[model samples]
Target: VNTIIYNVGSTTISKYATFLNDLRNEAKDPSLKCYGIPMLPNTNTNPKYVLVELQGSNKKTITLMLRRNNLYVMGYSDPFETNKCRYHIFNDISGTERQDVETTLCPNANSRVSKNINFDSRYPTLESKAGVKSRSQVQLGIQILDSNIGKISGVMSFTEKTEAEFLLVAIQMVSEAARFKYIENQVKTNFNRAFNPNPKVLNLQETWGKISTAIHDAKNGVLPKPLELVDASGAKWIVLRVDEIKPDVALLNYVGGSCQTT
Candidate 1:
């Protein structure tokens, strides 16, 4: 909850789609797989809602595939889920985006929309422009995510949370990837959805499908918790839990002294 959460809406729904897809292309992490997920729409009459899924480990590719996803908070998603909303601020938006994400409920249904700015930036601001707001944060975050990624790119390494930080960075980037999309692309693709054809519809459908499926797996403990790493002594480390303590500080608990298989 330390990470700043910026909320915005009244932006067209289709822009959210373009925002998500562009996020995928930008990640360029072919290792990360994408899926279109569906969820309860803003309004019952609205098209099936969509949430983007930028999943999988950064593997060949990683398999954070979120196997058995649940879409409800409790009675629906059940308590069988992992740390509820732990990843919400990161790559998971169901909670972060949904937490305070209550817009007018009908995006773009009214061309004249009232935009609310709860900029998550330390000091929230409206740049007189929109769309690229999420990009700046994501871009800078990528800088560190990739840097620590190199921490694990070793021949000989023995670090406490160093390796864990690497894993955490990945965890951090993974979720933001999906959210960046939700806010930007929609309706006419910014290039225009309702104004033209239907890519926006399909995009939302896919994104929503992906998110719901992810939510399902999240309930079953498929969330990104286990991270694999190695040490200078060739011993293996698998993170058990990476807890976010304060702003930018992470507490990592891992199972060290273990050997990796394959």
Candidate 2:
């Protein structure tokens, strides 16, 4: 069997719990519901997990299941695998702090986690940082995954700091990439350009709104847009367009002021 593993250990369980609760507290849309399995002290081996459900025109569900000592987050179109994409976060179970993500069905999506840089260093800070000081900065990579591809390749940068804020950032990134129709359109467009001359047009507004709302609701740490790129002059450019050509990478168009280019 082919599977991806994200080995975040017990140390991050509290962080993950906090992340789930935070999602519920700040949700403006009551349709969004999140729940998790209780931690069993005696077992000390609880298969802790979180389920985030959203209802709307684009109703879907995301399961952040930590089983067998690893984290596997999968987006579902139905109660079953009507259509889906999976995100895996791997960490050392021996209590080390490193975290890495695997984009199984999506291409061109990646994130960079660093202690040397601040979150805003790569993107504009639309909101302020609060609560516990962030131990590491994360650069989010969002892209539509190809359904035809069972597995894709991309490198992810990660570290030991497991803050609720960082988990939120990562979840938001995966949410944007896992939109049911977005993945469908990606597969269609890949075979025929006529299906979607520009894939960004389908959910650009919706995605931006989702990320913006999550950031606006977050209580701790700075929240940058899911995607950002630096120019030759060192100026950070926010993503204006995303075109996934394959399962491992996407063409990102960035904007600086009134000008826009890829």
Candidate 3:
């Protein structure tokens, strides 16, 4: 649920309008492709806010969200839909320090040469060149669910942990970890192996491949052990079904700015 955080309609919060307008003005660059999102307060969850194309890169999109408390957050458009998207995310908002939000470290389940970023939520702060920094604004985490037993017909973050979209933030963070796992696995066993001249390789296919195949194998009694999904909360969940991940769908993430509170 959302409440109008700021309104220029007979309201003195023109500062917000200016900031938002500045972002909207990005469309003038002809590449930022910014657009004004008409909003009806408290109506939808993933409502309109700031939508901009990556001017530095391609037509990929960045979705901005402002909450009732005036907290600002940034999310992304679908990767498949915005195929020109960046492999790395650079977020510099409202004078905060720039952050590479997509990077994570995940230690292996066995030797874990990597670190699991999602083992707990990761906080990112917008940084500046003057050695100044913004509040730790965004929190990233992961959640895994069994979605194939007549569930998740197909699926689905301000980048929030609310029941509304917190799951997605968690998923994205965890998926990032899983990806590094595969990348680590891939670099091994090169002493002797057959080569495929033309492998139908894809970006993250290995992630899904290992997860789905492993899940399928586990479910069919073909594996030697249970697929325990160690989560951000440090709980173990057995990989029960080949959960369907529809990438075209929007993921909910939470972004807000404020001081810490108990």
Q: By lDDT, who's the top model here?
A: 2
Q: What are the per-residue Cα lDDT tens digits for candidate 3 across 37-114?
A: 111122133333333221111222222222211122333222322222222122332222112122111112232121
Clashes of each: 45, 10, 27
Over 4 Å off in model 2, which ranges?
1-177, 192-262
Best-to-worst TM-score order: 1, 2, 3
Name the TM-score of candidate 1.
0.23
For 42-136, candidate 1 gives per-residue lDDT tens digits of: 22222122232222123111111110112111100101122221111112335534433222122222332222222221111211122223222
State the weakest 10-residue window (summed lDDT) of model 2: 33-42
Shift in Å, residue 211, candidate 1:
12
Q: In candidate 1, how many Å is residue 139 off? A: 11
Judged by TM-score, which candidate is best?
A: 1
C-alpha TM-scores of all predictions: 0.23, 0.21, 0.19
Model 2, position 175, has a per-residue lDDT of 30
